[model samples]
Target: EVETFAFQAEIAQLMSLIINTFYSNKEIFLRELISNSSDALDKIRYESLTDPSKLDSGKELHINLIPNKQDRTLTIVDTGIGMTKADLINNLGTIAKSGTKAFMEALQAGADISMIGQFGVGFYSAYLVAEKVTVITKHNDDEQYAWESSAGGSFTVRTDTGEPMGRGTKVILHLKEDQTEYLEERRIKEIVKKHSQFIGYPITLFVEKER
Candidate 1:
């Protein structure tokens, strides 16, 4: 079954702000996504400390960047704490009532752990480069789900049965014509080195070469 949701009033305003004014450096969108992946990795590791099963059959923690030039898509995949159906709606659906903000505040008051996404607005930055974005995620306790949006005011969430995702989140950005620069391996490497060089998890980019 598929479910559709309209973007919250604040979310539409925030998307406009982000696409127009928030980030002067457009490439910073990659940095924001990588940071969010690292945060997810941290959460899974911390949760594993309390519940061993959260580790997902000993899969190594890492992030993968896959660029499909033919499809005009850049995909960032992370083997971390994935989101459930509710998480898709609550986290990516509405920005005004953000769980990331609450989670960060709780961390400051008690756990005192540091995370990268402070504003809870990083995910929406995908709009900076992508014309459309699709997020396929599988949580340990929930079935796999896909969330898609064009920033046109609404998004959809539905059961994903294409291929088993195991456990984690995969964010696919369909690049706009001018944003094709991001599909280049050299460009992605430069951005990663310049911005996310210190991120904790291993980030691998799939590169294609001509024979």
Candidate 2:
């Protein structure tokens, strides 16, 4: 299918801005994912209030972080409502909002986190820390789809190799060597708390313990 405009032209500029400009505070990728996960949980909670069955129907809502030093990859996985084909395409394709306009507008109008997430541009920011990124997601009512990108112009989406995730999503970031700072639990948690602590969901760091 021919691709229509997904994000704005300035999106590339914004992506460049994030990857290059934010060099000093590059670990914010965890913050971005955690905040997004918290919002996902909030959506689930709101839906459940109207339909209690969803409590049992959908997968448990939670956040997990795992870091592999062997290959220098840090995976941030979440069990929330995964994205559909259309969502994956559209969400990753364009600048739904980079908040650049919103940031400017907010400066003019004075909105808060209400506008914090205004720019859908944050998702792409993952490319900043990751040399390669894999977004493995299973939607509540659709087949599993994986979106992989390395901040290049295009992204590829394919079927997930593993069994169904049941529900929700997982983002595995293959961190660059310098990006290993994010692999640390204290670092990841601090980043999460700084950006998403009161986000209303339990965020935990999951690591395999060796006996």
Candidate 3:
């Protein structure tokens, strides 16, 4: 089922403020996003502490930044704890705390949302430089799904027929005019080093070169 809903009060308020006040602060987009990647990784690790199987034994935990210069697309992938369609609504909805009962409990036990929020909604910062955004994610407890939007208040979420990712999430950003600079290889590494050098997990950028 494809569904759409109005952004939560906080999300609506945040977007309205950005559109009116901070639309030009695109430089912080990378930092905000990488920070989110780190938090996702952190969340999965914390869960694994009590439920070892949650780590999936061989699943490599990391973040990948793939920049496509030709198509003007930048994709960030994480091998961390993925979320179900419901999780998407909770985490991405206008209200951050709309997560599941288990999700709320986990955070209540001591998951960091405050720091993550400063840049966490960093997820939305993609809109600062993107014309469209697509997220393809798979969770252990749920089938794969894709969520898309044009920075609009209402967005669509539907089952994905494409090959499943098995686990984790992929965020694809379609660059806006003049924002294609983010597709450069060196620039990606530079930004990662600047904003995510201290990130717990490894962050990689896919670059094409001689074999």
Candidate 4:
């Protein structure tokens, strides 16, 4: 069954604190997203160290930015370690319930907590500019899934039978009218270079020209 969950009370309060806080520069949101993508790709590369067959069909690690003008959507796609259903619920829906517990379990399983902060909070930064956000992801161990939210205290998640992503995540941000400048390839590239130039993967931009 496809179940939806609300943010745990403790975490919901914390999110409200950040969501309502003053944020002067929304551009750093891009840096946070690409950084998370790079971190995810890096983690998978490390996992493939022991189980060298981790990546699907020997796929290369890279990030792609796809711009959709008609719908006013911008998608950030990464060929990296995706998330399981539990991960979606735990990571986005209710971090309070699963975060420390998952961290402890990972710690016990010889996993470090260093990367925990990478995507957890950075993902919410999308709300700084987008009106709605959708995440389509596929993990090696779980079926594809989609999660959507408007930065409200609650969110929804369900199975995705759409085109398989092999192994990665696609984050689609529906921009507000004022944020449409992000749809321009040149502007997107400039922001990527300025903020994520040191990212560990290829950051490719996709968009059609007006001509």
Candidate 5:
């Protein structure tokens, strides 16, 4: 039954285009990702009322960021429906949800193909700013897993080394030398308000405790 899910082939071209197009102005990558985080919290919140256990877990619906300037690190975490190994491959490799159908509709209507996108687009975009992007996820009905990708086809998926969250996803963006400005409070907050002030989920940038 694991084979039940599949990603459409459009994902490769999509990845290629996004990789090249997004780097020139890489900051929007954060906006795309935060939008995803908001989706996660929404999914979990909807599921919580149906499953009593989810309510047992903290329903604190918000995004948490951990910014470490000394280490030159940045993390974006969110409360959302998490993914499994099958999801990792399917989502990253292909565009699910009848991608061909979507394309056909767009093509018939003379719409832009590039405008149509699947979420794995953001996952790949992380590579634009980081040497390696790590994903930590805990699904409501599945064990947690960590997924990492550098570029092209080189990537890794394994059990998470960190403690478990009741439900959520966290993406760690390992900043390149030039992309370190995102770790600053002013820059992060400014970007949050400018691009994501209307985001339905709460977002927080994590950092070492300041005195």
Candidate 6:
């Protein structure tokens, strides 16, 4: 059954802060998302160190950037540690409840882990360019779920009835009309190079060419 949720009080305030205060650099939304993906990939790798099976053998660790001009959407996909329904709520539904921070706290002292999400609100930056955002994720221990919001006061979560997403997460941004520049392959590549060149995992951008 599909379920709906209201954003935590702080999320509403934070969303406005991001959209209004950061309007000048809307492109950083992509950078924020790439950072979040990198953090998820890192989480899975760190987990696999203690529990080998969590690696979900045969699934490579990487990120894919897909821009669909026809749909005016940009999708960022990652084969990483996915989230459970509760995780979706605690991390994305609420503000500042960072899973990466929690994961680090659960680990041994002096452990060397580099994670990109400190505030947990980076995901909200999607609103800078997108009118709507959809996150479809599958965790090893839970069924796949889709979480969607438009940076509004509430969001929805439902069991995904579509084709299996395999493992990990896919974030689709339905860009606002004025933000169509993000749909360009050249622009995305430039953003990736400028902001995430040293990301640990391989980030690929899908390209199509006419014969």
Candidate closest to the true structure, highest TM-score: 1
Clashing pairs in 1: none
Q: Model 6, range 1-211, lDDT digits (tens) per residue?
A: 8788786665565555444543466777888888888998999999888988887633699999998888889999998888899888774544454433443353345422222134455677788888899999998889989999886778899999877877789999998888899988889989999989899999999985652
Segments in model 5 whose C-alpha atoms lie over 4 Å from true places:
1-23, 96-120, 209-211
lDDT of 3 at 160: 90
TM-score per candidate, chains pooled: 0.85, 0.79, 0.80, 0.81, 0.76, 0.84
RMSD of each: 5.9, 4.4, 6.7, 6.7, 5.0, 6.8
**Per model, how many backbone clashes are there?**
0, 7, 1, 0, 7, 0
What does the lDDT read for residue 4 in candidate 1? 90
lDDT of 2: 0.67
Name the regions of candidate 3 deviating beyond 4 angstroms.
8-10, 16-25, 94-120, 209-211
* RMSD score of candidate 2 (Å): 4.4
Q: Rate the local accuracy (lDDT) of all candidates.
A: 0.80, 0.67, 0.71, 0.76, 0.68, 0.78
Best by lDDT: 1
TM-score, candidate 6, is 0.84
Q: Write the per-residue lDDT of candidate 2 for residues 63-96, one digit (tens) a residue.
A: 8888877778887777766678888876545445
- Candidate 3's displacement at residue 119, Å, is 7.3
lDDT of 5 by residue, 1-211 (tens): 1222222345444444544443366766677778778877887788877885775656678888888877776889887887878777665455433454455456467754333335234455565567667888888667888877554534567877579787788888878787898888888888888888898866766657764
lDDT for position 58 in model 3: 33
Q: Who is ahead in lDDT, 5 or 6? A: 6
* Between candidates 5 and 6, the TM-score winner: 6
Report how far residue 45 has shifted in candidate 3, in Å.
1.6
Point out where model 6 deviates above 4 Å.
20-22, 91-118, 209-211
